[PDB]
Design a protein around this ligand. Structure first.
Ligand code: CLA
Ligand code: CLA
Ligand code: CLA
Ligand code: CLA
Ligand code: CLA
Ligand code: CLA
Ligand code: CLA
Ligand code: CLA
Ligand code: CLA
Ligand code: PQN
Ligand code: SF4
Ligand code: SF4
Lengths: 46, 74, 139, 80, 65, 753, 74, 137
């Protein structure tokens, strides 16, 4: 089992987990707040 | 000029800086580099230094000018 | 004249050309303990005879490849010699030059094209302009 | 013909001589290294310029250098 | 220098020029380059050892104890 | 006794320890990374099993286990198509109205405006119009509802798990010995009679009992809900007799050799079904049934354990002079003797042949499926018809290049000169200059007399001298031999006189015999061949011969040449032998595969371009009530394809209107991918036109900056190897070009198809 | 004529610019010797060539990433 | 003052785009946000100017937010690399991420602007020129 834990720390595995996690964060930001633009961030919805 | 002109000048700036980068790197590495410390003894235009040390294709200063013409045309 | 029996070979397209008859040709001779199949340097397989063999080859690199990588490495044959044959009939033995293989140090061999410095101390080409001397040939 | 030069950083490992496909190099007695031998290039007329010797050389920088020069029939590796 | 010394290479054409290596052994004969230096980083040929002379080395740390 | 099952018990323990040891399979890679080149070498040598170990038995076990893993991948992919066609598709709506609904099985989420790609595909559905032909295949299989597709999706996942367990079992638990893998005769008998023969018989059973009854009702016009489930045609034998009377006689005619009674459902019609435009399912049922008998009989050809049969070794050792035909005795007194040693030890040699024959099979699939559309409503679905031909042409080209690649690997690694003494393999290598020189000459003849005549046509047309052009209206080049074959094949069925009286309709309408229309669109019609077809076919002959020249030179000179006599010692894949001998760049057999990939791409691009333009110009179109056909490009192939200005203008420029104007519509993805393919193609030129010496020196200055900020990595950055740069360049080149054509083909057909 | 003249003189200018750096690289190998240029401004440039090349690489990367990125965003 | 850019809520071309936009999630609220906050050109599309003392936070907030995140990633990687140098096998620490070390590096990188300033003042940010590998001139 410790070998599987060591495998999960591999650079390609950590890169995939980091890229997926960041992709999900950005994807949900598009779903919750679509159309965000420069000069519009952190401003209340009209 | 509007936003369309803004972006193309930055494309031109990219082209100017890369073509300068290829030319300047070739000129300043003409004497030699870590991969070929004694490049000055081989002249301006030679094919390579063989497949050894990882491979040395397009290592001469002439090759940098050759690569820069592609970027100048672009 | 060079003595030996040519290996059993049915003919090939990678043999000698006009250069062999016009400029120069090479011959590799060796002695084998038995009849066995080897690979011709320019493609195909040939059968080397029981006694001493003689093979005509277009380039010197063919003899070094056959003798070095096949005769010595694979068949444990260490007595191969390479000759350069000219159209006029003159034949000179060129490998091994002094009867000892080059990779083994032999007394009496002089130092040829030795530079008494490290390679980083070659002079700049600007110092040798119009003199005809290359930086690696500079004293 | 190509020019092959051997510099004083040679350690006499004989690897360049073994790697040469046309027998340009041989090992000669020397005293500048522990191996008491140095590479020599008596037969540069047979040099093709493959630079296999430079690849085999373990010193840094190279103890053997090939400078491609005038092209002949045997330096171009021509069987015709 | 001596065995175990931490040195900085001064040979200009060396891959480890101005880099740091560790002295492995010193030859007591009169050869041109008696000092053997080992490096953590391999060069472009994958080699991590080379021979240097004393004047091509700069002692930066004495051997331990 | 000779054929037996011998295995080893628990040869490899099942432990995840080596998962945390990257590069363990290779001695050099096991020590760990010192430069970034180590990372690339790990992936490059991952599946090069013969370099992991020299034990052939261990290699063969790796081949067997990995093949189960790839079967699991295919089953997961197949399960995905069935599941997406059962959960996110308009399949049920399409089954009701095949000619008025676009198939769609992919639906996108709505987060960044990408929901615009959910096209109006009809049937009250929004999604991407698929071109894989899944709906037409499923309808021909009798599938009518999404539940049946859902069951097949679950079955695919179960089969994927079974395949995965089989690979683990046959490598970690019971791994066969090398003797097991070397049973040629047993393997052929089981794969001919048991895999191809039994599969054809099993599918014939599915067709006769399920596909024909369901499709006969569908073509009669009854609703989906009124069609009984497939098992009802097996239980209630009265239903099956109404559709085909001969089932009232049961199995009696089969066992009494009175098979003529079965003519009502095992038909031999030829042609196409007028309702759907596909082949008669009764025709395909008798086709597969005849294949099953032929394959099963073929599966008793080889001698395994009972004396009867043929032996591969005896057959090969006999094919030599003077046992050959008198004009075929040139193969020498050894002949095929010694070739048996190749198949005992070389996996690469078998992979070379098998990849070639998948190229042959996939090429036959491409050519024979457009001209003889086997699925209902496939011919009139122009988007699917173009995609299927193009896809299988491309798959064939890669497989053919792979066959030449692993033929070269066999020569470098597995070839043994002692095994081949004056045999045909040895003799071929001994006149390789004969073969390559003649192939080089015929390539120049073909290039001059195919492409330079296009340049002749461009200059004559530009001069205003159409009468001097190579065209139907000028200097004619009629493909008389191909025209003669079309007339012979049309007259064979009755549409060198009636040589096939049993077929009623023409075998393919592409050769003649009439036109078939389904939904106001042409399914198939005679494909006339003129001067333009003569020129384009000899373009194909030229491009194929050159691709052969590149690959076959690499195989024949893999061991060495007059330039580098010891390339075999240098290996299959090495960059060069230095700048000496004038320069020996790209001498290895690997770079001949690398160069051959470009020529395969160039050859096949013109094949799919020839198909796309000719079908749009002379076959596909709409038929009015009066029977007048207006084609998609109005028959401009004959006059415009004879110059490459016409290809530039009337094919590339004109037919790219759909993809170039697809922004702000459901086809905008094809527009984006059209530019994406162009980018990757230009991006690849950086790797192909440059060398690693420049990039390594550039990395030196970049590494200096990271060293200045104490952020230089321990794994030293290295430029890609010379071979790696070539591999990256060719990979991005083919990806960019193929994606560009993919978007070009699909965008146009999704709009006007 | 206006389009022809502008394109003609810009492309010629690009070729001349490549030649300026090409013969600059030739100058380093053939005509430059460190002894007679010891410590001058020409020698100083050669002594921080890595900083020059790396910063030119950064400008090229910054321009390329953001100019192309904004195009494909649009 | 700039006159060729006007507020999007007062641009007839922008109103034409707003009216003709599809009534989906992607256009309903974003168009309202553009109308109140963005300046539009004659083409009716929002334009981003850099010639306004006002709405300076509209320029500084995205710039500062990115620079903090990019510096956070860069400082995490730099501190992690420096910590692995003392290890026996630093290359092995790069293809195998050390979780305790990566978490420690990430935690400190939150305050990277302060740490970078301290390193620069103490001379620990950069290595000396003569101790960096270079090629012969
Ligand atoms: C009739 C017997 C039979 C059948 C059907 C097969 C079938 C197959 N063999 Mg095979 N083989 C056999 C006997 C048989 N073998 C014998 C006797 C030997 C020893 C000489 C071998 C030695 C051998 C080797 C060394 C290799 C194969 C491989 C393969 C596969 C080739 C890939 C392919 O076409 O996918 C076909 C795709 C399918 C989905 C076919 C179905 C796959 C399953 C496993 C078959 C189950 C059928 C079974 C009767 C259950 C039927 C249920 C129902 C219909 C009643 C294929 C599954 C290759 C492979 O990929 O191995 C994994 C391979 O490398 N075989
Ligand atoms: C059944 C098919 C089959 C099989 C079993 C093999 C098996 C093998 N091949 Mg082979 N090959 C095949 C088909 C096949 N090939 C075909 C069709 C071609 C023609 C293109 C080749 C061309 C080829 C070459 C040129 C070489 C091999 C090599 C090898 C050996 C090592 C495998 C390797 O390098 O890992 C593969 C490792 C990789 C990293 C490859 C993955 C990268 C691919 C190219 C990217 C694909 C792009 C993707 C599909 C689309 C875009 C993706 C998206 C993310 C952008 C192995 C024996 C090598 C060898 O040494 O043989 C002894 C070798 O040099 N093959
Ligand atoms: C000559 C072989 C042959 C041919 C012409 C066909 C033809 C057909 N099959 Mg079929 N099939 C075959 C063999 C064949 N099958 C075998 C062996 C199996 C598995 C045991 C199946 C299983 C199968 C299923 C499950 C289905 C079909 C279907 C179909 C129809 C769709 C079109 C198609 O598949 O492409 C036509 C294919 C070709 C033109 C060529 C491919 C055939 C093989 C690969 C040729 C191999 C030759 C090779 C290159 C030479 C080998 C080297 C040599 C030394 C021997 C069509 C009528 C579908 C249908 O519903 O029918 C309406 C369907 O669902 N087939
Ligand atoms: C290879 C697969 C396969 C399978 C599983 C079946 C299975 C079946 N067939 Mg069948 N059949 C097949 C191929 C197959 N057939 C082929 C290739 C033909 C053409 C010669 C027929 C022609 C046929 C007839 C004419 C009849 C069956 C019938 C039957 C059913 C009863 C037969 C029995 O058990 O005795 C059974 C469901 C009988 C039945 O129940 O009819 C629905 C029946 O009357 N079959
Ligand atoms: C359009 C570009 C182009 C052209 C014209 C060629 C032309 C050729 N390539 Mg080639 N190639 C190209 C791109 C091109 N390549 C690219 C991009 C690659 C990278 C993959 C390759 C890779 C490649 C390989 C790997 C091979 C070739 C081969 C060939 C030759 C094939 C024989 C032939 O067609 O003779 C006929 C010649 C032509 C069709 C050329 C055009 C002639 C024009 C139309 C007529 C000229 C009239 C008159 C003579 C002009 C004289 C006027 C005077 C003032 C000069 C031929 C010289 C093969 C070869 O040498 O085999 C013999 C070969 O092995 N090429
Ligand atoms: C695309 C870039 C471009 C363009 C539009 C022009 C435009 C012009 N050039 Mg020009 N030029 C350029 C690049 C360009 N130049 C470059 C890079 C060079 C360096 C070689 C020159 C060298 C040059 C000379 C020496 C002359 C011109 C002249 C002219 C003018 C008349 C020719 C004409 O109608 O246009 C040119 C139209 C073209 C289509 C250019 C391509 C022409 C051929 C086909 C290119 C291939 C050359 C040849 C066939 C290959 C070798 C043989 C015109 C203002 C002439 C002038 O000053 O007028 C009095 C003149 O004498 N140019
Ligand atoms: C006034 C301007 C000028 C002058 C005096 C020189 C002079 C020189 N250059 Mg130079 N150069 C220039 C501009 C100039 N260049 C520009 C603008 C560029 C950028 C493109 C270059 C790029 C360049 C490189 C890369 C190299 C030189 C070299 C040389 C020297 C040797 C010339 C040579 O190779 O033989 C004569 C060479 C030729 C005649 C080349 C053949 C023609 C080429 C291939 C163009 C193709 C012809 C085209 C189709 C039609 C053109 C018109 C036709 C009438 C020719 C020589 C001192 C070389 C050198 O010093 O070696 C160390 C060298 O390697 N130059
Ligand atoms: C379309 C063609 C194309 C493109 C895009 C590039 C791009 C680049 N070249 Mg280049 N080059 C090309 C053709 C091209 N080249 C050709 C034909 C030649 C002649 C041989 C050269 C010769 C050349 C030289 C000599 C030099 C360059 C340099 C550069 C870089 C400077 C620009 C930059 O940093 O922008 C930023 C980078 C880009 C725009 C590249 C694209 C980045 C992608 C889009 C990021 C996408 C990430 C995404 C997750 C990937 C998906 C996953 C995927 C891996 C599966 C850049 C990587 C210079 C360099 O490296 O300096 C730093 C340099 O010295 N090139
Ligand atoms: C580990 C973090 C890190 C840091 C702090 C730097 C810092 C620097 N790099 Mg750099 N670089 C890195 C990683 C890093 N690099 C990686 C992984 C690559 C390979 C793609 C490069 C490739 C690269 C090139 C080609 C160039 C620089 C340049 C530069 C300098 C200015 C431009 C810049 O910030 O790069 C901007 C960033 C990039 C160009 C690409 C890096 C993006 C990757 C994906 C970040 C990865 C972070 C890492 C995985 C996080 C792990 C931490 C975790 C273990 C805790 C600066 C000294 C330039 C220079 O020398 O100018 C003076 C230059 O030309 N870098
Ligand atoms: C450009 C180029 C290089 C330079 C390319 C290199 C060193 C490879 C770089 C690979 C990178 C590191 C892969 C990762 C790139 C990804 C786009 C990063 C994703 C980052 C996420 C945060 C998005 C060569 O080394 C080379 C060698 C031989 C012939 C031609 C060439 C050649 O053309
Ligand atoms: S492949 Fe590269 S290293 Fe090899 S000979 Fe060609 S240019 Fe030189
Ligand atoms: S390979 Fe290098 S170190 Fe070894 S003997 Fe030859 S020149 Fe000397």
């Amino acid at each position: 089992m410790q070998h599987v834990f060591k495998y999960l720390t591999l650079a390609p595995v950590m890169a995939t987990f980091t890229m997926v996690a960041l992709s999900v964060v950005l994807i949900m930001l598009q779903i919750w707040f679509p159309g965000l633009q420069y000069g519009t961030y952190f401003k209340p919805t009209p | 000029i509007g936003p369309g002109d803004f972006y193309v000048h930055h494309a031109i700036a990219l082209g100017l800086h890369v073509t300068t980068l290829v030319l300047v790197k070739g000129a300043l590495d003409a004497r030699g580099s870590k991969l070929m410390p004694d490049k000055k003894d081989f002249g301006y235009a030679f094919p390579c230094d063989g497949p050894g040390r990882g491979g040395t294709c397009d290592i001469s200063a002439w090759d940098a000018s050759y690569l820069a013409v592609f970027w100048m045309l672009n | 004249t060079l003595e030996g029996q040519t290996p059993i070979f049915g003919g090939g397209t990678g043999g000698l050309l006009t250069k062999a008859e016009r400029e120069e040709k090479y011959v590799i001779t060796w002695t084998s303990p038995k009849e066995q199949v080897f690979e011709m340097p320019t493609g195909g397989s040939a059968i080397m005879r029981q006694g001493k063999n003689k093979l005509e080859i277009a380039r010197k690199e063919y003899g070094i490849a056959l003798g070095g990588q096949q005769l010595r490495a694979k068949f444990k044959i260490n007595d191969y010699k390479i000759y350069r044959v000219y159209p006029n009939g003159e034949t000179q033995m060129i490998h091994p030059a002094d009867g000892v293989f080059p990779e083994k140090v032999n007394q009496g061999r002089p130092k040829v094209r030795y530079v008494d410095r490290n390679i980083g101390s070659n002079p700049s080409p600007a110092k040798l302009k119009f003199s005809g001397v290359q930086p690696y040939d500079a004293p | 013909s190509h020019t092959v030069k051997i510099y004083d950083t040679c350690i006499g490992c004989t690897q360049c001589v073994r790697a040469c496909p046309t027998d340009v190099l041989e090992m000669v007695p020397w005293d500048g290294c522990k191996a008491a031998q140095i590479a020599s290039s008596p037969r540069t007329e047979d040099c093709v310029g493959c630079k296999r010797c430079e690849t085999a050389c373990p010193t840094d920088f190279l103890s053997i250098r090939v400078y491609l020069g005038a092209e002949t029939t045997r330096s171009m590796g021509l069987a015709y | 220098v001596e065995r175990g010394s931490k040195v900085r290479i001064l040979r200009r054409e060396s891959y480890w020029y101005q880099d740091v290596g560790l002295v492995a052994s010193v030859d007591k004969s009169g050869i041109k380059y008696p000092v053997i230096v080992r490096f953590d980083k391999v060069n472009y040929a994958g080699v991590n050892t080379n021979n240097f002379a004393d004047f091509e080395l700069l002692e930066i740390e004495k051997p331990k104890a | 006794q000779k054929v037996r099952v011998v295995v080893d018990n628990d040869p490899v323990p099942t432990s995840p320890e080596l998962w945390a040891k990257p590069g363990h399979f290779d001695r050099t890679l096991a020590r760990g990374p010192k430069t970034t080149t180590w990372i690339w070498n790990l992936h490059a040598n991952a599946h090069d099993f013969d370099t992991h170990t020299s034990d052939l038995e261990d290699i063969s076990r790796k081949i067997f286990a990995a093949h189960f893993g790839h079967l699991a991948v295919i089953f997961i992919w197949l399960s995905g198509m069935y599941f997406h066609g059962a959960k996110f598709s308009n399949f049920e709506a399409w089954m009701a109205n095949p000619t008025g609904v676009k198939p769609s099985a992919q639906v996108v989420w709505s987060l960044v405006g990408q929901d615009i790609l959910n096209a109006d595909v009809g049937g009250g559905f929004h999604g991407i119009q698929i071109t894989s032909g899944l709906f037409q295949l499923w309808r021909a299989a009798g599938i009518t509802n999404t539940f049946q597709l859902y069951c097949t999706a679950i079955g695919g996942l179960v089969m994927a798990a079974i395949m995965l367990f089989a690979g683990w079992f046959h490598y970690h638990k019971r791994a066969p010995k090398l003797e097991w893998f070397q049973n040629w005769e047993a393997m052929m008998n089981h794969h001919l009679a048991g895999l191809l023969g039994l599969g054809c018989l099993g599918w014939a059973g599915h067709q006769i009992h399920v596909a024909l009854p369901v499709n006969k009702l569908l073509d009669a016009g009854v609703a989906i809900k009124d069609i009984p489930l497939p098992h009802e045609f097996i239980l209630n034998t009265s239903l099956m007799a109404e559709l085909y009377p001969s089932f009232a006689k049961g199995l009696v005619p089969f066992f009494t050799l009175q098979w003529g009674q079965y003519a009502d459902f095992l038909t031999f019609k030829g042609g196409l079904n007028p309702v759907t435009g596909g082949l008669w399912l009764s025709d395909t049922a008798h086709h597969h049934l005849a294949l099953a008998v032929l394959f099963i009989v073929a599966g008793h050809f080889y001698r395994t354990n009972w004396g009867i049969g043929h032996s591969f070794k005896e057959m090969l050792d006999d094919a030599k002079s003077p046992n050959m035909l008198p004009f075929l005795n040139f193969i020498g007194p050894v002949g095929h003797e010694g070739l048996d040693k190749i198949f005992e030890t070389s996996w690469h040699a078998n992979l070379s042949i098998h990849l070639v024959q998948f190229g042959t099979a996939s090429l036959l699939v491409a050519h024979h499926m457009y001209a003889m559309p086997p699925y209902p409503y496939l011919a009139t679905d122009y988007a699917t018809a173009l995609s299927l031909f193009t896809h299988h042409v491309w798959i064939a080209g890669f497989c053919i290049v792979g066959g030449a690649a692993h033929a070269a690997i066999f020569m470098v690694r597995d070839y043994d000169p002692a095994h081949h003494v004056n045999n045909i393999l040895d003799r071929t290598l001994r006149h390789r200059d004969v073969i390559i020189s003649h192939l080089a000459w015929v390539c120049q003849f073909l290039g001059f007399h195919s492409f330079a005549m296009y340049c002749h046509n461009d200059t004559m047309r530009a001069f205003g001298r159409p009468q001097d052009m190579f065209s139907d209206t000028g200097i004619q080049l009629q493909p008389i031999f191909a025209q003669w074959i079309q007339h012979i094949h049309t007259a064979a069925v009755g549409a060198l006189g009636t040589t096939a009286p049993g077929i009623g309709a023409p075998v393919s309408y592409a050769w003649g015999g009439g036109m078939v229309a389904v939904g106001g669109k042409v399914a198939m019609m005679p494909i006339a061949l003129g001067t333009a077809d003569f020129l384009i076919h000899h373009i194909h002959a030229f491009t194929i011969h050159v691709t052969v020249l590149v690959l076959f030179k690499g195989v024949l000179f893999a061991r060495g040449s007059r330039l580098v006599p010891d390339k075999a010692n240098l290996g299959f894949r090495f960059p060069c032998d230095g700048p000496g001998r004038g320069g020996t760049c790209q001498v290895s057999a690997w770079d001949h595969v690398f160069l051959g990939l470009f020529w395969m791409y160039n050859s096949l691009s013109m094949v799919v371009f020839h198909f796309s333009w000719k079908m749009q110009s002379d076959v596909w179109g709409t038929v009015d009530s009066d029977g007048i056909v207006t084609h998609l490009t109005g028959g401009n192939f004959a006059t415009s394809s004879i110059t490459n200005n016409g290809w530039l203008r009337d094919f590339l420029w004109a037919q790219s209107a759909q993809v170039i104007q697809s922004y702000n519509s459901s086809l905008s993805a094809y527009g984006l991918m059209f530019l994406a393919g162009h980018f990757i193609f230009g991006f690849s030129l950086m790797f192909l036109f440059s060398g690693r010496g420049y990039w390594q020196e550039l990395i030196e200055s970049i590494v200096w900056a990271h060293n200045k900020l104490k952020v230089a990595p321990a794994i030293q950055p290295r430029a890609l190897s010379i071979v790696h740069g070539r591999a990256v360049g060719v990979a991005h080149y083919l990806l960019g070009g193929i994606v560009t054509t993919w978007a070009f083909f699909l965008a146009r057909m999704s709009a006007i198809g | 004529t206006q389009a022809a003249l502008y394109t003609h003189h810009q492309y010629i200018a690009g070729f001349l610019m490549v030649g300026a750096f090409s013969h600059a690289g030739i100058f380093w190998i053939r005509d430059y010797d460190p002894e007679q240029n010891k410590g001058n401004v020409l020698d100083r440039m050669l002594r921080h060539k890595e900083a020059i090349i790396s910063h030119l690489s950064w400008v090229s990367l910054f321009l390329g990433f953001h100019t192309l990125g904004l195009y494909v965003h649009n | 003052a700039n006159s060729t850019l006007v507020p999007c809520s007062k641009s007839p071309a922008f109103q034409a785009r707003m009216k003709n936009a599809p009534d989906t999630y992607y256009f309903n609220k974003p168009f309202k946000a553009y109308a109140k906050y963005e300046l539009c050109g004659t083409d009716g599309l929002p334009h981003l100017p850099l010639d306004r003392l006002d709405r300076a936070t509209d320029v500084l907030v995205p710039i500062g937010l990115f620079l903090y995140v990019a510096g956070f990633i860069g400082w995490s990687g730099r501190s992690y690399l420096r910590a692995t140098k003392s290890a026996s096998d630093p290359e092995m620490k790069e293809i195998f991420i050390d979780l305790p070390l990566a978490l420690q590096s990430i935690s400190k990188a939150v305050l990277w602007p302060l740490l970078a300033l301290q390193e620069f003042l103490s001379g620990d940010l950069t290595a000396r020129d003569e101790e960096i590998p270079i090629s012969p001139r």
